Design a protein around this ligand. Structure first.
Ligand SMILES: [Zn+2]
Ligand SMILES: [Zn+2]
Lengths: 205, 691, 111, 260, 48, 213, 51
């Protein structure tokens, strides 16, 4: 029956309709949503393509109820209730939801525009106006060399060293003695991790 | 009086509580169509406790669609026996079969059933104190003994009989027994229960018990395609169509109250509360609201209507007003006066809007029937309706008298609602209190609730013959004793005014005489008791025995584990009384050795056996045992879940939860999982399960 | 097609008023309702052809990958134009070409 | 690739006109295969209409819910099925009796128009339109998407007892419905063959299933020109059909019990 | 509360001590209440 | 029109039923076998052309040769239900008739479907055997198909001789299901064995045997 | 979007950053800057004119 469009986001248990997340980002009216998706009012076919999505996404009206709706399915525990479930949903929308476009407030318009662009591209592909993307296209592929791999491994090892030195400082403050910071850190962590990963080829701890 | 619309309301609001009850056909194993042995596993989930309401079984006028018509009481007894084996076969309990019979209930329930019997009036032979119940008790006793002695699977079954002599309302005895079990610290909190009843009110009764592992068996009302054609032409069909009342296995339904508990947890969690939201207390308040909307005790409120979704109206009202409260409306059997005062005040503000809406709804309905096919004139839509109503009902023109009567209405109504709440949560608090008026007041009258005082008088259960003559009308004097007949129908009696042949009928703006107002004078206890005690001395010994209340009976099998211990104590050490507490069967109470019971005697069927009805052979008393039973002493029982309560598996999956907020399957019955808590957030189990 | 709400900026849906026996457009995000001037409610045709030229741009002339023909342009009579097949990727799309002139900046067919 | 091979009668196989008639009569055709345009209009007046093009038509017909469902067909595809629009309207009426009032234009109309009314109703009208488009079947055996004519060369003895080649006509149909095809008059029900041996067993029997499966395996083996002795394939098909039903070629002791 | 691998390690180090304490006196069951950095009760778990 | 097609299909079903009865060892007159479509229409269809399903009901008796070969071949009755959707009074009358005049096997033919009540009621006509057939399934005689070799039901003595010759148990023979269309056509029973003569490209003729499940 | 029916969207490293009116001079200048060495030679500049 209805040809609905849904979004799969991290840290949720099931898909969410596009109108729901659009309301969650902070655009309530349908006209603004259509203006974000569509770019030509004469394209009535694409306009009615998403009409089922418009009509099914009606029980959600404003931003707060959308945030409650998305936080309801956001896995985690139960009993959080609205007063902080809305905060958790806002955090899920801010970080881990398109982190590359932005990670700070005041740039949600960019996120809405990119989401509209993605939905428009999907609709153009579905309306047979553009060929589906070829996943064999070598121009849309990358080769990780020693640089990025060593960078990721060093990031992991350095956060491990940071946690270890934080624990050592917390333990040493209780004794209240002047630490030299030279015997505090264990240089064997980074060296051992890098040596093991390079020797065995199993990338990771 | 009870409404299946409440069942309709639950179906149209919470449809996931319904299951169609797998009919226990004979099991075909390796080509053998074995009749379902009672020891065979139940394909409908095992049940621990099964409480029977005999008012739903032995009561022919409740099911007059077919033609039982037993000319002899033998046919009645045998048919009731067969129905009992059918229901216990399809339910298959394992621990306790509480056979509960109606007795003498408190005074307000006496008024309710007095109205019921007056409008109802052998169909009328089902009433405690009559010889019909006298034979019924003995017949049930013999049937229980026969089943315990004969069925190999009934070794661990103990049958507790509360005959018509024992006072108490039918389901009230189950409630008292449940509270008595709760009062024992050794009670098992996971003991699943089930009550075979027809009244929808039992739903809330389950919520009264605060035992989530509770279910109700009912007849499938939605699926009767009733026919009354010739008795021989049903031979045409064998599978699709049969005689739906005599030759077809009647379908049933199961109402699981744990799913309803999960629901009421969902939609009653209102946002922005000054105090933490408790699902227990909120459920108690919801049951309170359901009782306020209408019950067999209190009269009909002139603003709340069940089929007009007044339950939903009050749920919404609670939703708006709870954020402004500092506490719940009621707590563990007692009322919080300010909270209920504020809620009634909010409904008073909404009263004018509700009355106007009812006026337009009535006019639109009348317009609809126009195209589809004591002088009234109150004009509730017009202003001044309260004054005209009070002038019509009371014929008193004094505004001060009306105001004082309204204040007394408020105080008596608060006392009665508290009485009903304590009656359903803490056992009977008063056997003598009754509501002293025929009508319910307006919510606008509920002001200054903290000033009013609450009091009760416990008293004693009424005499069976006194109660019979207080409940039997002049048209059914056959069951009433001939000695008191002169006190009931003779015009020279000092209490003849209590039983007028013709009484005023108050329609109260209703639509069907089923829910009309039977305006009748209230019974004066003093002169009535004096008159009945004047002629009480002329009764015979059998009549006096039938006018004497007694204690509970427990019947136990010879092969049962608790039988040798009871023998070794009572019949060897000579101890007159013994204390149970918890046992292997879950029963608890005081055991008295029965002297009337003969150890070497033989128990014979009190029913003339009829051929083709599985002739009952006589069985000696050597093969079972019977004791006098009492419960633990009455105590103040809290309304909260017990420790170690294991929840079931959640039936809802993110669909009903969203829909309610925004406008076989037998695995959801038992205690799924072993932990009484559930993992969440950052626990060890939660973190292991999530990743 | 369809209209938007004048103050709600919301989606309008058709409905009937029987006191007047008429068709109107209404928004239940609001209470506004306006006179519908067309009894048409829905269109669906199984045979579709639109999407032939698709997104042609005035900058298509400087595309180096497109082949350049020598066809005589109709109105400006130029002898320099590019050509390309239909942009619709439907399975039964015709192979007839569209010719865009580099002088007058317009497209024409091969008829 | 479900497929049916249909052999025509002796006199039909030598003629192309009767064979084309049979092919037209067997090809499945539903409402969607002929309908072109579907519309929903607001038509409050029962006697008259809002649409100008249907004015005289209602005057030709008459002489409720106001929502009207309008159906327009394609003339070429309409005539290509050798049907009449009148019997199409009759079928549309009889599938839903008189609860859905239906009227049809004249056969000579420039536009083939069918108007339906029922006696909020947008959603039910849409679902009824979908049901009409997806269920209303006009002509043909269900499950037959396409039929192809094929010329077959068969060796037949002459009056002198000499074998000679002869060219006849037959049909190859996408989709499998063996019983209905065999029941069609003008079709040689004693020689109809299918490449789906499961429904061959469900229709013909176990022995015919063995024969058909041997034919299929022989075709697969001999497509490239390789030769395999008949006895091996006969043994394989006998193993596969020995139990009275098809058996797919696909996947106790205490010492082994303790060894596990 | 638990949010990382070191959290399981510390929790099972505490679990060993509490299990030893219950095993000494023969306590058949153990119950934990989980608190965050704000001393707010988060979860309650039971073990044998 | 459609009425002519319906009458033709009904006549084809009647011819297939007669062929099955003849193949089951019963005696059918040559005139009954050679009843043309026009004669069937004249003797069955009325002025408006509707058929009379009660008229095609008939009684058949085994031939003396078949009775000698198969001693268990009793009387056979064939009835066609008038109603498209069968009313259960039809086979109620069927059952009481079979009981009252003691027919061995009765074959009931329905048009669209039979309610499961009658389906599980018809086995209670012991010792008589009742078999059901859909009228649609009887349009085409599948026994005349090229891919279907001839099946001949073996007598008890022939079956015993076969088992002795091959030194077999009853379970070691190739099996055929009771719901197999050929088995339904022949009216097989459990334990009975059919001989199949089959064209073979290595020996010309081949003989096989299949025992009903 | 109503007035910008002819504007060309600009993507940097896979994220939409803005729109431009005349892209021919923009791409010419960017290509000239990359060729002159002002921009890193490995920076990919692509102008897909179809959309
Ligand atoms: Zn609006
Ligand atoms: Zn030009």
């Amino acid at each position: 029956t209805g040809r609905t469009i849904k979004a799969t986001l991290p840290y949720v248990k099931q898909d969410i309709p596009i109108v729901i997340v659009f309301r969650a980002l902070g655009v309530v009216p349908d006209g603004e949503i259509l203006q974000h998706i569509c770019y030509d009012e004469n394209d009535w076919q694409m306009l009615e393509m998403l009409k089922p999505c418009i009509e099914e996404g009606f029980v959600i009206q404003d931003k707060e109820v959308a945030l409650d709706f998305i936080g309801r399915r956001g896995s985690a525990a139960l009993g959080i209730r609205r007063e902080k479930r809305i905060q958790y949903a806002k955090d899920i929308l801010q970080k881990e939801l398109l982190p590359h476009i932005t990670q700070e407030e005041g740039f949600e318009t960019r996120k809405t525009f990119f989401l509209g662009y993605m939905v428009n591209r999907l609709l153009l592909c579905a309306l047979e106006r553009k060929d589906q993307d070829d996943r064999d296209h070598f121009g849309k592929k990358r080769l990780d060399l020693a640089g990025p791999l060593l960078a990721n491994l060093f990031r992991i090892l350095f956060r491990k060293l940071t946690r270890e030195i934080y624990r050592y400082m917390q333990r040493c403050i209780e004794t209240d003695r002047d630490f030299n910071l030279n015997l505090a850190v264990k240089s064997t962590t980074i060296t051992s991790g890098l040596k093991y990963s390079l020797a065995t080829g199993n990338w990771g701890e | 009086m009870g409404v299946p619309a409440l069942f309709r309301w639950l179906s149209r609001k919470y449809p996931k509580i319904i299951s169609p009850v797998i009919q226990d056909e004979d099991v075909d194993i390796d080509g053998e169509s074995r009749p379902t042995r009672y020891e065979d596993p139940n394909p409908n989930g095992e049940l621990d406790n099964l409480y029977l309401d005999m008012n739903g079984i032995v009561h022919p006028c409740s099911h007059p669609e077919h033609k039982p018509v037993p000319e002899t009481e033998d046919e009645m007894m045998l048919d009731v026996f067969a129905y009992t084996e059918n229901v216990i076969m399809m339910a298959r309990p394992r621990k306790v079969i509480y056979i509960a019979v109606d007795g003498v209930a408190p005074r307000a329930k006496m008024n309710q059933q007095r109205s019921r019997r007056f409008r109802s009036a052998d169909s009328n032979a089902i009433t405690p104190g009559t010889p019909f119940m006298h034979r019924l008790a003995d017949s049930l006793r013999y049937w229980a003994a026969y089943k315990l002695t004969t069925d190999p699977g009934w070794s661990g079954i103990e049958v507790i009989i509360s005959d018509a002599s024992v006072p108490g309302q039918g389901q009230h005895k189950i409630m008292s027994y449940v509270r008595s079990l709760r009062s024992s610290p050794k009670h098992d909190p996971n003991t699943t229960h089930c009550i075979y009843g027809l009244n929808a009110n039992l739903i809330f009764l389950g919520l009264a018990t605060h035992e989530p592992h509770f279910k109700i068996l009912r007849e499938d009302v939605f699926a009767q395609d009733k026919k009354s054609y010739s008795l021989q032409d049903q031979l045409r069909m064998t599978d699709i169509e049969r005689q739906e009342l005599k030759d077809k296995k009647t379908p049933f339904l199961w109402l699981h109250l744990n799913i309803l508990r999960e629901y009421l947890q969902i939609e009653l969690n209102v946002p922005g509360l000054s105090f933490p939201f408790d699902l227990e207390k909120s459920i108690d308040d919801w049951v309170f609201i359901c009782f306020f909307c209408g019950n067999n005790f209190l009269p009909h409120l002139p603003s709340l209507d069940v089929r007009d979704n007044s339950i939903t109206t009050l749920v919404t009202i609670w939703k708006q007003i709870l954020p402004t409260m500092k506490g719940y409306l009621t707590t563990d059997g007692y009322l919080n006066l300010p909270a209920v005062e504020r809620l009634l005040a909010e409904l008073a503000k909404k009263e004018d809007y509700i009355f106007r809406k009812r006026y337009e709804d009535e006019k639109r309905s009348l317009e609809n029937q126009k195209r589809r096919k004591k002088n009234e004139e109150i004009r509730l839509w017009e202003p001044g309706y309260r004054k005209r109503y009070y002038e019509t009902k009371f014929h008193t023109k004094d505004p001060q008298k009306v105001k004082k009567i309204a204040r007394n209405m408020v105080q008596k109504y608060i006392e009665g609602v508290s009485w009903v709440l304590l009656y359903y949560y803490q056992g009977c608090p008063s056997w003598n209190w009754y509501y002293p008026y025929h009508y319910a007041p307006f919510a606008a009258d509920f002001v200054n609730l903290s000033e009013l005082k609450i009091e009760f008088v416990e008293g004693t259960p009424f005499r069976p013959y006194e109660q019979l003559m207080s409940v039997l009308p002049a048209a059914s004097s056959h069951n009433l004793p001939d000695v008191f007949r002169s006190l009931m129908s003779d015009a020279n009696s000092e209490i003849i005014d209590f039983y007028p042949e013709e009484f005023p009928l108050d329609m109260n703006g209703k639509k069907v005489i089923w829910q009309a107002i039977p305006l009748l004078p209230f019974i004066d206890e003093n002169r009535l008791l004096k008159a009945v005690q004047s002629k009480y001395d002329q009764l015979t010994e059998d009549e006096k025995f039938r006018n004497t209340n007694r204690s509970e009976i427990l019947v136990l099998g010879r092969s049962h584990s608790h039988y040798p211990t009871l023998v070794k104590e009572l019949y060897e050490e000579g101890k007159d009384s013994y204390e149970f507490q918890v046992d292997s069967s879950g029963v608890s109470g005081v055991a008295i050795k029965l002297q009337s019971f003969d150890r070497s005697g033989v128990l014979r069927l009190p029913v003339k056996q009829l051929e083709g009805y599985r002739h009952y052979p006589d069985i000696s008393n050597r093969d079972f045992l019977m004791v006098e039973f009492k419960q633990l002493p009455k105590s103040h029982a809290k309304s909260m879940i017990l420790s170690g309560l294991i929840p079931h598996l959640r039936r809802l999956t993110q669909e009903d939860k969203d829909s309610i907020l925004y406008g076989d399957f037998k695995q959801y019955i038992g205690p799924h999982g072993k932990s009484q808590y559930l993992p969440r957030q950052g626990g060890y189990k939660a973190f292991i399960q999530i990743h | 097609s369809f209209r938007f709400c004048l103050e709600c900026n919301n989606m309008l849906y058709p409905k009937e008023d029987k006191e007047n026996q008429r068709l109107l457009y209404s928004c239940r995000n609001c209470d506004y309702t306006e006179l519908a001037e067309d009894p048409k409610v829905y269109r669906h045709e199984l045979i579709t052809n639109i999407g032939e030229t698709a997104g042609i741009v005035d900058d298509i002339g400087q595309d180096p990958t497109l082949p350049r023909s020598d066809k005589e342009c109709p109105e400006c009579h130029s002898r320099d134009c590019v050509f390309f097949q239909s942009q619709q990727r439907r399975k039964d799309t015709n192979m007839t070409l569209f010719y865009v002139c580099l002088n007058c900046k317009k497209t024409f067919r091969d008829e | 690739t479900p497929a049916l091979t249909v052999y025509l009668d002796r006199e039909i196989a030598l003629d192309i006109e009767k064979a084309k008639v049979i092919q037209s009569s067997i090809e499945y055709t539903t409402l969607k295969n002929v309908t072109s345009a579907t519309e929903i209009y607001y038509d409050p007046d029962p006697t008259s209409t809002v649409i100008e093009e249907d004015f005289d038509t209602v005057e030709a017909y008459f002489s409720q819910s106001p929502w009207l469902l309008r159906l327009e067909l394609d003339r070429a595809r309409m005539l290509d099925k050798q049907l009449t629009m009148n019997q199409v309207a009759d079928k549309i009426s009889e599938v839903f009796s008189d609860d859905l009032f239906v009227m049809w234009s004249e056969d000579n109309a420039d536009k083939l128009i069918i108007r339906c009314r029922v006696i909020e109703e947008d959603q039910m009208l849409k679902r009824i339109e979908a049901h009409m488009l997806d269920l209303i079947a006009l002509r043909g055996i269900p499950g037959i998407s396409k039929v192809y004519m094929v010329k077959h060369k068969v060796s037949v003895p002459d009056e002198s007892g000499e074998y000679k080649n002869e060219e006849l006509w037959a049909l190859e149909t996408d989709g499998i419905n063996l019983a209905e095809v065999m029941a069609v008059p003008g079709v040689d029900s004693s020689r109809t063959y299918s490449n789906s041996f499961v429904e061959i067993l469900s229709v013909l029997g176990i022995e015919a299933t063995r024969s058909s499966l041997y034919k299929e395996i022989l075709n697969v083996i001999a497509f490239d020109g390789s030769y395999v002795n008949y006895r091996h394939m006969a043994l394989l098909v006998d193993v596969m059909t020995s139990r009275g039903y098809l058996m797919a070629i696909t996947r106790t002791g205490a010492l082994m019990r303790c060894s596990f | 509360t638990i949010n990382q691998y070191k959290d399981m390690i510390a929790f099972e180090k505490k679990l060993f001590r509490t299990w030893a304490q219950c095993f000494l006196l023969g306590i058949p069951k153990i119950i934990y209440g989980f608190r965050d950095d704000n001393c707010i009760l988060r979860t309650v778990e039971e073990f044998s | 029109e459609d009425n002519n097609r319906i009458i033709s299909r009904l006549w084809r079903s009647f011819r297939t039923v007669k062929e099955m009865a003849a193949d089951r060892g019963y005696f059918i007159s040559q005139e009954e076998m050679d009843q043309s479509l026009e004669e069937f229409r004249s003797k069955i269809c009325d002025s408006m052309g509707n058929p009379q399903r009660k008229l095609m009901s008939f009684l058949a008796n085994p031939t003396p040769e078949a009775l000698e070969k198969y001693s268990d071949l009793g009387t056979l009755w064939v009835e066609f239900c008038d109603e498209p959707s069968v009313g259960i009074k039809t086979m109620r009358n069927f059952c009481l008739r079979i009981q009252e005049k003691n027919f061995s096997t009765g074959i009931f033919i329905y048009q669209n479907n039979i309610t499961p009540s009658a389906n599980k009621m018809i086995p209670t006509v012991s010792p008589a055997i009742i078999e059901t057939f859909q009228e649609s399934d009887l349009v085409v005689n599948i026994t005349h198909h090229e891919l279907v070799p001839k099946h001949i039901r073996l007598s008890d003595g022939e079956k015993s001789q076969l088992l002795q010759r091959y030194k077999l148990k009853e379970s070691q023979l190739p099996r055929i299901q009771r719901e197999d269309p050929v088995a339904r056509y022949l009216g097989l029973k459990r334990g009975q064995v059919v001989k199949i003569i089959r064209r073979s490209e290595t020996s010309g003729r081949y003989a096989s045997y299949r025992i009903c499940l | 979007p109503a007035q910008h029916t002819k504007s060309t969207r600009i993507f940097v490293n896979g994220v939409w950053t803005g729109i431009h009116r005349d892209p021919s001079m923009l791409v010419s200048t960017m290509r000239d800057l990359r060729r002159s060495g002002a921009i890193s030679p490995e920076v990919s500049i692509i102008r897909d004119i179809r959309e």
